[PDB]
């Protein structure tokens, strides 16, 4: 009762405390008719994709790969990269990763034990015990949400005003 985020709204009844980044924020009750693991996986995937996208947009408006095709702004880079076939390679490998993801999310939903977003990818450690893993999961979630909103703002401002890196 009385979820932490919205103090005047009831607790979403599906997010008690046992999830990283769980401040009880679900006013429209998306968790009431969708699996929690599915939504967590979707959120983490969005976080990672948008973090990579924000970093790439900002960097590519500064540094360009050698070649005349890579001499466009990130706003206009989509139509150039799709014509050159640059985005085709990313599409192919992302589709391979996403088919393996289809298998992984299916197994997670039907038992297994794989945590949402846990691909066990960890060449370095950066997370030795449970406490470090929880803290870094919270950091990843917060940074990913911030980067999703940041990429949203960057794209909207760049489309509104065709400016360089300062999209004001």
């Amino acid at each position: 009762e009385k979820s932490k985020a919205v103090p005047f709204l009831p607790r979403p009844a599906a997010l008690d405390g046992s999830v990283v980044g769980d401040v009880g924020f679900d006013p429209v009750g998306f968790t009431s008719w969708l699996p929690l693991s599915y939504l967590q996986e979707a959120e983490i995937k969005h976080c990672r994709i948008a973090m990579l996208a924000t970093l790439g947009w900002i960097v590519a408006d500064f540094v360009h790969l050698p070649g005349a095709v890579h001499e466009v702004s990130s706003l206009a880079a989509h139509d150039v990269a799709v014509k050159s076939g640059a985005l085709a390679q990313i599409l192919i490998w992302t589709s391979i990763a996403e088919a393996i993801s289809v298998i992984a999310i299916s197994q997670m939903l039907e038992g297994s034990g794989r945590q949402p977003g846990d691909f066990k990818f960890d060449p370095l450690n950066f997370a030795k015990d449970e406490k470090s893993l929880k803290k870094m999961q919270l950091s990843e979630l917060k940074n990913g949400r911030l980067a999703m909103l940041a990429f949203s703002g960057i794209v909207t401002q760049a489309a509104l005003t065709g400016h360089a890196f300062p999209y004001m």
């Binding site: 009762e1 009385k2 919205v6 005047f8 709204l9 009831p10 006013p27 429209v28 509104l160």
Partner: protein, 177 residues
Amino acid sequence: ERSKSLPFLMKPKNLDGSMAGDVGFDPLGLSEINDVGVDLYWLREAELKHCRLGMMAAAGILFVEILGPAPGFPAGKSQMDVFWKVYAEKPSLIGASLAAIAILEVISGVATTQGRQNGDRAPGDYNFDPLGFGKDPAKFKDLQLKEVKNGRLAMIAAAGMILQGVSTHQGALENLS
């Protein structure tokens, strides 16, 4: 048995004494509506939202007309017509404000319906007391009465300002003198 405000009318059944500003002024018996998701809880929440919105709007009109606009913002003293001058030059501000108000209003409606269902939240309550001006009781009732009276007065005032600006196309205090 008779309403305090209207002695020629019987006391409205649903308005005993609880809500701040209750004087029994329900001649049409609207407090007894229990259909289309509308009841005393919904009516009180709507009244409080109207009170707060009217207070904010009246304060904004008076502030802008007396102390002038903020730097970088248009002038004209007609608040119903300066809106189109702001939108003509800063449409993004208006759009962002509208989107924020839309999200907050969706949250407000969800909260109203939930609090009506599992009764734990008083109508118009959003737990918004950052400065702790209404922590203790015996002052909360007085603050509720002050808010309700000021909000009704500002509702009437803001409706008047809207109509005056739409019709006369002049400022509020311009109409005053």
